[PDB]
Amino acid sequence: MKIVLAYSGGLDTSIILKWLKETYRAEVIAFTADIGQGEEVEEAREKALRTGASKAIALDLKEEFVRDFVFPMMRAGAVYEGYYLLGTSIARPLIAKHLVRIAEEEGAEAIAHGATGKGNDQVRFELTAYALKPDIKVIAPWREWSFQGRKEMIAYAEAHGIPVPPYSMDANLLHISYEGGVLEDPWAEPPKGMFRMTQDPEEAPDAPEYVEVEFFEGDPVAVNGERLSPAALLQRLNEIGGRHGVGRVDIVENRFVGMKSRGVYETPGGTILYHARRAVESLTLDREVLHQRDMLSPKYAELVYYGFWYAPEREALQAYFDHVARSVTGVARLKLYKGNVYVVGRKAPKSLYRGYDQKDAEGFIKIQALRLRVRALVER
Amino acid sequence: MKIVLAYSGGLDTSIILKWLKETYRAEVIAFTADIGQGEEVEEAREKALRTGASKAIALDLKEEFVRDFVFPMMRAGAVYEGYYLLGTSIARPLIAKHLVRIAEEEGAEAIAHGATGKGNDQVRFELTAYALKPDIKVIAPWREWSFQGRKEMIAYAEAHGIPVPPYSMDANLLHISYEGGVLEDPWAEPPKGMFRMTQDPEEAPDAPEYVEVEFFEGDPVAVNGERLSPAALLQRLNEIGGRHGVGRVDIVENRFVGMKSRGVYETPGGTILYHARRAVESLTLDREVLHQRDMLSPKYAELVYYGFWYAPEREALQAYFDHVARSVTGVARLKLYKGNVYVVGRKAPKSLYRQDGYDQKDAEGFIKIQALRLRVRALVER
Amino acid sequence: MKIVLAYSGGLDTSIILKWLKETYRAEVIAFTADIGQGEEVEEAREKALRTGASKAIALDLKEEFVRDFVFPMMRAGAVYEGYYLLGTSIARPLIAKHLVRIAEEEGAEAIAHGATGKGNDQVRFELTAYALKPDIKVIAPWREWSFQGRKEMIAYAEAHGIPVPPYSMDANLLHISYEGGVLEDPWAEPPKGMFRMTQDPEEAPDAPEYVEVEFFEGDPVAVNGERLSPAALLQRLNEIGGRHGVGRVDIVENRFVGMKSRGVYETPGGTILYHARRAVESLTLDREVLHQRDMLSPKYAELVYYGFWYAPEREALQAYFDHVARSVTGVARLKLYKGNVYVVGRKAPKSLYRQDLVSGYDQKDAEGFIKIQALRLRVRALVER
Amino acid sequence: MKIVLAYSGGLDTSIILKWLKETYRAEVIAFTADIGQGEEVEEAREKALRTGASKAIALDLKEEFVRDFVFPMMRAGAVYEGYYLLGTSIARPLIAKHLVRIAEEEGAEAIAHGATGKGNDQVRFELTAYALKPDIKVIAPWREWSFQGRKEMIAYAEAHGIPVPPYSMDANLLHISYEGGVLEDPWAEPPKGMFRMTQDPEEAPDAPEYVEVEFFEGDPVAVNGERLSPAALLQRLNEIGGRHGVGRVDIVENRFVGMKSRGVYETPGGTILYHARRAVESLTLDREVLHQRDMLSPKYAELVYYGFWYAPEREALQAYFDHVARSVTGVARLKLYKGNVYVVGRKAPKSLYRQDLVSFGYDQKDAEGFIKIQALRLRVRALVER
């Protein structure tokens, strides 16, 4: 029996790698994906072999991530509950996609992940795992093992030679999320020094910095006149936005599984892209199209947040969003200053910006007012 | 014949006042509303009499503006095309509401306003005017007169004893908008020193300021523990927020009448209230209710923008938003710093947040059921 | 330990009554609700006492059913996936509501029901049970026991001496649903003679019958001039409509649990009420209000279908629907003829219809409206250059 | 100057043709489109010459109408205010399209139509024209002339020699609408003998008739096993459904321009197609996709009703609906009987229906977990209400 494990190299997945060998007497194949966590994925691939993996795979998926997940999601103008740019949500479908692919190539009947038994992550991983390969078997140790506490896990780890090292994290090219610990009290401001991807706004440059982003077809293709591949482009905007402390969010969100959770997110590059995209759309999109699109975005956002990426509903809405996005061509000019992003200019080859006279307006008014007058008259 | 005129005290409405008397051989009743334009409405009232009004009325409508228009709108989480807080839109229905009220009391058959014959304000004024009094007669001079140029209008003013004088503005308790002139080039950043209501972020305090806003029932009732009336509260948050340069928006918006226009808006108090409200809702509102509410907010925003305030659709939605907003009770703690507003804390008496009802096995069952239709889809695609 | 069982009186709930006693060795308070199944609930009550129940309650909830559940739902124009009028969905919440109330009075820690693990009902009972009393315990025998088939159950019943006997059904004041058995083949038409509430159109009167329904405030208050209570009014319309074979639906629906299911429903009075209301709304509701209401109807419908009646979302939407429904005051006239319902007329005290804007604006006005509405399209074409 | 007129062949457009000559002294190019009005369009074309047209064009547009307008609209499940299948609405865009095309080829400066100045049709004609040719000039005689009353127009007509004579009609392959006259009172039942496309339920066959419709990719492609082109298929279904009195609607609808209006519609083929399509969708469409599609249908419907066919919003929605419709492949079996259409069966090569999941991999215990997770927020809510 073989099992493909989503291995990140941490303590837990290392413990899980041992547990799987022991518990299922199976051969474990480790898979580590580089999606911009800023760690040396090769060190994880090696540590997996040291921990007992019968094979360790490590792939650079940054380009695929941005191009096939982040970009399509951004085209939809997806925002969860007013602020969340969904950094963790769009990433999971990618990992799971590869776990299933690898499992098929290696002839493995099962895949495994170390997402906890009470969070949303497990749902995200498995929803796409089941959607891509319906008969795959999933093993989620956090739902099957008996461990009573951390102390016992630490002890278990020491027993197996696994090296043991105030809040949880998750980082990738789109963002870094923080929760748990000091963050669990929604009335307590995040601690000083927690942020890693972005500079403290109070420590940001005293001079604002301008940046231009070009869109060709719904997708950003250049920064300050330099053409850049999808991953390279997000990276660049993370640097520029990060240096200024842009893209910070502090919310209490509604979980799909549990109840409410307090999360802090920094999405410098994506935050810039969000306003840059809308800046171009303000010249290129038709009014009614824009209004309909924005009324569908929230639905799309929750689908991504819940984990229904490879679900027919999300793909259906995507056809709509992509159709609209095809018109988004032009350049956005923004001004970055101490935590804030300001749209300062926009232009487009097919801008709709600058057919009737005043008498025309009077007629429009009269026709629009008719049902209101009748109603008023009827209220007698 | 009597005509009630929405008189602002400026050159154009003064010219309009003279124009109306002669053109219609009628007497004009001037009405000036104080909605926070930062002007002495009483001097406009006197100037009207001097300009020929048979009667001039000036009312302080700041409290009503915030209590009956701004708050109801904010409860709905209304935002037009991603950023516009509707500062100009919610103020028009209120002005027209009084014009029609005064016309009825004075026995006037018509009302008049000085909105341009080609813009959006005209629609706002008239849609509410007709909705409140179907038989009212509306006279929009800009759509009716023969003036062919600005210069001709000045000569007319000078001939009638009416005193004469980069972009145009509109200010009230919620915001100040800027449009036209140099702002007409969507690629050009607004000129230095244009903002009046908010300090430039570059000149804002080096020290961040924390502010707490209490919501009792969907509406903000206190700032930093101090109970404030609707207008006094909006005012207070404009002062606090303005000092930090909070609430600046630069957008090209879609108009109801013509095409697009580049507008710049500064809404310090409203911006703080926007995030504060959502902060309290994050603990008080149910997930499914929040999601449904946010999907209707845009529709509501466009109704307000287009001018359908006293319209049955807006009121039906308002019934929904008010039902939801009733649960928004609690306090939001925000941090202000150089142009930005950061939510740093929130609490509530009936918070649904328990940082802690089901076990791991439960989650697996949930996954299986949620995944069924997807698995069936996959097998069918073979 | 005490368990309150939603007891209907059939073989399954009877077996469950025995099973609960042997399995949990607790007292079982049986509860049978009269919601219009055309069944004598006292029989079930007594049959429950015989079967072992330590106590049996039988309540007449017809008026409550129609008044506090069917009516509010109808005000919203609720229709699931094009044709389902939610006959079974709005009933469950009512029952669950009483199960929890009873358990609270009897000091019972749990409630039980005989809905299967494959359906929506289990969700409806439980979602409302937990929403009304979070600490309640729910026992669903179909999900816990070992019976591997009909046969095993029949024997088990006889072992405990319990009376024993194509498709199964569910009936109440709103409709009768048929499902399973021969109905599982979506290509196969329901067998002839299956329907019970409606007469076969082929046997319906040769002369059309006209019926008038008065709505006062979003709810129907009279039929053909006779004022009738909510439950009484639904009954009358079932008789009138059933006679003509009105309201038959045959659909493959999507269950909340994940799979498709072939269902057949007959909702005579509801189908008449459905059209009667829209007919009155056509004169009393503003255009924009109507268009918004119709786009929200489907969401409300799935909420009810899934079991989220006592959920904040449904109640939030209800405030909107009730607000709009408040204006639905007037009368609808419909013609019933062999399975069909045709709206032939409608009137209302505050109708917005004036046969004069057809027989506050002129020709010139329309021209202007057209120019303003066309501007963005012309600019689009121009820019497409 | 040249003016391309949407000439229907009737009294009004005949008067208009004269009015255009006499008022604008323009060369009038008449255009009649056969979209299935059941009128020998060629007659109209000759009559236009007899009336003064310097050129008369008649085109058979049945196929284009169904394939490029009716089908795309049905693909979206478009229903205006619960009952209107938009028979008149989807036709206008097609006509205006040709009006504009003929104007360019003929080098004509303006186009004209005879929709009244009080209705929605004028909007439909013009939104389309302006959408395809922004520089086009439009002449709407009803909004420009001094005529007041049919008595007066009949005089002008007689004067010029144009032949002269309870409700107004409008027919095409999709339906026939009736409005005005004795129909204006919302409380009055329509008059016996009005309907033309459908047999009266009471006079319909005594035995029910079954019909099957196959959909391949969102569109109907065959009836009772016979492949049929878009126009021929609608025709066949009008014949079959008509004989049984199917597809009659009687509503008071909300107008875009006027206030409210009482309309009666008969759409036999369309009504069958509507229930057939949903029958095939019940097996081929995913639950969440269906629920989402149905919530958007009403918006698409008012877009069509208001005349925004060639508008960016409608085409954007169309992309959503076409994406969804692509999966609708299968056959629906319907029972026609005295005015009604009953769905009695449906099958599909890629049906998502699995009997094994409903009959007695799916594990009953999974439902409990599903239930508990779904119930959490409700329990917390109750507990907090304490």
Ligand SMILES: Nc1ncnc2c1ncn2[C@@H]1O[C@H](COP(=O)(O)OP(=O)(O)OP(=O)(O)O)[C@@H](O)[C@H]1O
């Ligand atoms: N405070 C107010 N009280 C009464 N009417 C007002 C007020 N503010 C605006 N209006 C009405 O709205 C129309 C004006 O717009 P805006 O406020 O954009 O006008 P202006 O051009 O700034 O002033 P003026 O008309 O004096 O030149 C006015 O002509 C007036 O009829």
Ligand SMILES: Nc1ncnc2c1ncn2[C@@H]1O[C@H](COP(=O)(O)OP(=O)(O)OP(=O)(O)O)[C@@H](O)[C@H]1O
């Ligand atoms: N009138 C009623 N009173 C109480 N509970 C009811 C009633 N009708 C249905 N129920 C509940 O819903 C569940 C039943 O469904 P249905 O009525 O579809 O079941 P059956 O399995 O067809 O009949 P039975 O349980 O009587 O053998 C029942 O097991 C019961 O717990």
Ligand SMILES: Nc1ncnc2c1ncn2[C@@H]1O[C@H](COP(=O)(O)OP(=O)(O)OP(=O)(O)O)[C@@H](O)[C@H]1O
């Ligand atoms: N088949 C067609 N070909 C060209 N234009 C048409 C056609 N059918 C309708 N129209 C246009 O739509 C307008 C008409 O509507 P309707 O058919 O409702 O008009 P009428 O005024 O009832 O008849 P008519 O004008 O022909 O006597 C017409 O005046 C005509 O310009």
Ligand SMILES: Nc1ncnc2c1ncn2[C@@H]1O[C@H](COP(=O)(O)OP(=O)(O)OP(=O)(O)O)[C@H](O)[C@H]1O
């Ligand atoms: N880069 C990655 N490659 C493969 N799987 C990953 C990666 N990052 C996270 N996962 C998977 O996602 C889930 C984990 O989350 P998180 O990354 O929040 O876990 P941890 O518990 O923090 O990590 P670890 O146990 O590996 O130290 C499952 O553990 C883990 O298998």
